[PDB]
């Protein structure tokens, strides 16, 4: 079973089998939290305006620009606020920056697209292995072409767990991700040292970092199951 980590997305990159998309602070952690709270589905849109379009339907609008909730949205991108929100049985539309680009990119060629985080890591890894036939790839969203220490650490936790579950053939990115995991046995340390955590502290949202540093506290795995208009439709596996 090949094990691959792409440290940043690339328009030209292709995925032959499974792809675990990671934006641990915060988009993919928030996505899992909404499904853990019972949301019927998550619609990930490619832009703020595209999410604003559902603003009339029976949905909850969640998202951020610069990490902060847009004035017309119901919720921001905090996974803590997502987990406690009244969304059971509801469709949540999410508009986030780095995370949606990565998912739309992987969705271009992958057979399966899963949204992974430290929060749902063991369940996400187990489903990836169950669905894979030749490769489990992990795509780290990073930020604007530069890799994130937090996403790579998460990819290292996933890579290590996948190795615990069965044999794996890693390539370079996966060896890099495992090295990042080995260097930070503490998930909260790896995440708190990251640029994404500092960005949240600069806008007063650092309380979200410990939530994102939780490991395997949810079995909710968003899986790409369809598309409507510009939205990718994720459902709980």
Binding region for a second copy (CB under 8 A): 6-8, 10, 12-13, 144-150, 152, 171-173, 175-176, 178-180, 182-184, 193-195
3-state secondary structure 66-118: CCECCCCCCECCCHHHHHCCCCCCCEEEEECCHHHHHHHHHHCCCCEEEEECC
Chosen from a second copy, Ca ion, none, partner binding at 208 (C-beta under 5 to 8 Å by type) = none
Pick the closer one to a second copy by CB: 183 or 228: 183
Tokens of 236: 């709980």
Name the site residues for Ca ion (rule: CB under 5 A).
23, 25, 98, 196, 230
Contact 18, 114 (CB under 8 A): yes
d(CA 93, CA 63): 8
Pick the closer one to a second copy by CB: 134 or 189: 189
Pick the closer one to a second copy by CB: 4 or 69: 4
Chosen from a second copy, Ca ion, none, partner binding at 172 (C-beta under 5 to 8 Å by type) = a second copy
d(CA 217, CA 65): 27
d(CA 209, CA 148): 14
Residue 85 CA: distances (Å) to CA of 36, 45, 76, 117, 227 = 10, 20, 11, 19, 24
Provide the minimum distance between the beta carbon of 195 and a second copy in the complex, in angstroms, as a whole number.
Answer: 5
Pick the closer one to a second copy by CB: 71 or 185: 185
Provide the minimum distance between the beta carbon of 27 and a second copy in the complex, in angstroms, as a whole number.
Answer: 17
Pick the closer one to a second copy by CB: 121 or 180: 180
Provide the minimum distance between the beta carbon of 144 and Ca ion in the complex, in angstroms, as a whole number.
Answer: 10
């Amino acid at each position: 079973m090949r094990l691959r980590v792409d440290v940043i997305p690339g328009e030209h990159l292709a995925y032959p089998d499974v792809v675990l998309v990671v934006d641990v602070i915060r988009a993919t952690t928030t996505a899992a939290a909404f499904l853990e709270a019972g949301a019927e589905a998550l619609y990930w849109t490619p832009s703020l305006e595209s999410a604003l379009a559902f603003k009339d339907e029976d949905v909850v609008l969640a998202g951020e620009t610069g990490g902060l909730k847009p004035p017309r949205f119901d919720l921001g991108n905090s996974p803590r606020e997502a987990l406690s929100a009244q969304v059971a049985g509801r469709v949540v539309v999410m508009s986030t920056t780095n995370g949606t680009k990565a998912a739309h990119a992987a969705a271009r060629t992958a057979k399966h697209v899963l949204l992974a985080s430290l929060y749902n890591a063991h369940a996400a890894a187990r489903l990836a292995r169950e669905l894979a036939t030749e490769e489990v790839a992990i795509l780290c969203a990073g930020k604007e072409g530069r890799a994130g220490l937090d996403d790579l650490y998460t990819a290292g936790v996933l890579a290590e767990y996948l190795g615990f579950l069965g044999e794996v053939e890693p390539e370079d990115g996966a060896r890099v991700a495992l090295a990042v995991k080995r260097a930070y046995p503490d998930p909260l340390e790896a995440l708190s040292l990251s640029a994404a955590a500092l960005a949240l502290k600069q806008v007063g949202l650092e309380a979200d970092v410990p939530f994102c540093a939780q490991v395997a506290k949810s079995a909710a795995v968003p899986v790409l199951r369809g598309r409507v208009g510009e939205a990718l439709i994720f459902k709980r596996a």
